[PDB]
């Protein structure tokens, strides 16, 4: 009946006042969250925007690494005290036809990621090892096996296993900028939070910074992760009769949570800094992973002497491809995770890790392999372009289901009535938690027209374009009802 029976408190080792061996105990829930926050299902946008306005708009990933962080301890902590994760306190203080709603929504969000997580990894396959494009997916398929070796070895080490990925990932870009010996002073130029970011006076590659900034900030957190980390913070048990030490426990999540996710904001800002020092000026013209590899490949992209002779040795590339497959074992762990946590919370459903993975990945593949079928049937032509529009098409479910996961949390968090008068939220975090609430609403409310009329492709069909804004349209005040109707229920409860 609580949220992750089978590692729910499991390992509580405070020991007096040495907090850092403690804090080496606890690090594991800020991972699992963070390598959440470096799919590559944003790595072209990173690189893009880099091209389009160089070191710019490296403020706006910290602004959003800093919101994503304020979102995700705010979970870590209705976990830590509640006792109980988001989801839980969702269906308690609400129906089951919400509850369902929000699962629905949630488990699509969650397979939205997961549907990138596989394009990344087939892709990987093809480059690093030649696969065929057909049978690098049915191979991704077989990670329920990877999972059954995962479920014997421990959170003490699946965690610093999920770090490994992290620092995989993070070492495969450094290595490359490292190489590239960029202009650090222009770094920290950009990393200022300055006022040509917001403006919308250049326009290169159809993209203005008011644009890339905006969705930057839209994509700042990812609402299966609040559910994960809200219920991975209780893996480490707590008395809950002692302020000290809970208010203890909340200082360990936060100050793990925010390493692990500031690891994943310099991972963002190392694919920015990528996309400007490495690559040439507008060198990228394929976001999808074929076309960064085979640029990453091409000694006339770079922009070094070094770079040119190291891409020509085919190097740069196969580093990208095994990132790639870093980036991609992460679903195969955290959707899992999460969505075990998302049904045994809003609809009660106690299933085995060997099913779950099982629908998941089969219902996130059997796009992909559509796609793979027509673009092949078509001659493998413009096949890795249509896996990169499938992959960012996917990714409307996240605006589908970000406001039911951050709206819930902030309410549930702020209001005595679950908090208490004693470890409920700051006056401080009630003003910014709102604000970046309400923003990222509004981007995502924004975002919904704008992705259901991507579905439509690059072709503007006259009489499609009024079917999307109609549909645009209803789905924005579906989501706005079922807005209104969780915030009445959550402030009857409050
Ligand atoms: N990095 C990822 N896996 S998701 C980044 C992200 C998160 C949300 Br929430 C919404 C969007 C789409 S924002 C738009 N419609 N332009 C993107």
């Given at each position: 009946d609580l949220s992750l029976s089978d590692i729910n408190s499991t390992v509580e080792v405070?020991?007096?006042?040495?907090?850092?061996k403690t804090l080496l105990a606890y690090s594991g829930p800020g991972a699992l969250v963070a390598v959440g926050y470096?799919?590559?299902?944003?790595?072209?946008?990173?690189?893009?925007?880099?091209?389009?306005?160089?070191?710019?708009?490296?403020?706006?990933?910290?602004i959003s690494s800093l919101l994503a962080m304020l979102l995700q301890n705010m979970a870590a902590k209705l976990g830590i005290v509640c006792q109980l994760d988001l989801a839980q306190a969702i269906?308690?203080?609400?129906?089951?036809?919400?509850?369902?709603?929000?699962?629905?929504?949630?488990?699509?969000?969650?397979?939205?990621?997961d549907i990138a997580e596989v394009i990344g990894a087939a892709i990987a396959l093809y480059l690093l090892f030649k696969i065929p494009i057909f049978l690098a997916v049915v191979i991704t398929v077989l990670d329920v096996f990877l999972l059954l070796l995962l479920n014997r070895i421990g959170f003490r080490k699946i965690e610093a296993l999920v770090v490994?990925?992290?620092?995989?990932?993070?070492?495969?870009?450094?290595?490359?900028?490292?190489?590239?010996?960029?202009?650090?002073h222009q770094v920290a130029k950009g990393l200022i939070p300055s006022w040509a970011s917001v403006q919308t006076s250049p326009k290169i590659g159809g993209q203005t910074p008011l644009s890339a900034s905006l969705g930057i900030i839209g994509a700042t957190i990812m609402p299966h992760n609040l559910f994960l980390h809200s219920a991975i913070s209780?893996?480490?048990?707590?008395?809950?009769?002692?302020?000290?030490?809970?208010?203890?426990?909340?200082?360990?999540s936060n100050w793990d949570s925010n390493i692990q996710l500031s690891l994943a904001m310099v991972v963002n800002a190392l694919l920015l800094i990528m996309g400007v020092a490495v690559f040439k000026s507008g060198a990228v013209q394929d976001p999808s992973f074929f076309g960064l590899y085979q640029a990453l490949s091409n000694p006339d992209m770079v922009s070094n002497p070094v770079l040119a002779e190291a891409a020509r040795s085919g190097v740069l590339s196969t580093l990208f491809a095994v990132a790639l497959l870093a980036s991609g074992q992460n679903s195969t762990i955290t959707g899992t995770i999460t969505g075990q946590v998302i049904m045994e919370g809003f609809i009660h459903l106690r299933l085995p890790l060997w099913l779950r993975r099982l629908v998941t990945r089969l219902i996130a593949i059997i796009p992909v392999v559509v796609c793979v079928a027509i673009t092949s049937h078509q001659g493998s032509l413009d096949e890795h372009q249509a896996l990169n529009n499938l992959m960012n098409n996917s990714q409307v479910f996240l605006a589908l289901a970000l406001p039911f996961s951050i709206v819930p949390l902030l309410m549930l968090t702020d209001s005595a009535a679950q908090m208490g008068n004693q470890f409920k939220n700051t006056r401080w975090v009630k003003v910014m938690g709102w604000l970046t609430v309400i923003i990222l609403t509004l981007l995502n409310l924004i975002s919904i027209s704008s992705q259901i009329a991507g579905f439509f492709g690059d072709n503007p069909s006259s009489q499609d374009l009024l079917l999307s804004q109609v549909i645009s349209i209803g789905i924005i005040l579906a989501m706005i009802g079922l807005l209104i109707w969780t915030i009445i229920d959550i402030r009857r409860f409050t």
């Open positions: 405070p020991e007096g006042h040495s907090f850092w470096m799919d590559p299902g944003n790595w072209s946008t990173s690189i893009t925007g880099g091209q389009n306005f160089q070191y710019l708009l490296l403020s706006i990933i910290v269906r308690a203080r609400t129906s089951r036809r919400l509850g369902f709603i929000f699962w629905i929504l949630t488990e699509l969000a969650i397979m939205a990621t490994c990925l992290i620092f995989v990932i993070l070492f495969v870009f450094l290595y490359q900028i490292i190489l590239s010996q960029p202009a650090w209780q893996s480490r048990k707590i008395d809950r009769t002692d302020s000290s030490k809970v208010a203890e426990a909340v200082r360990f």
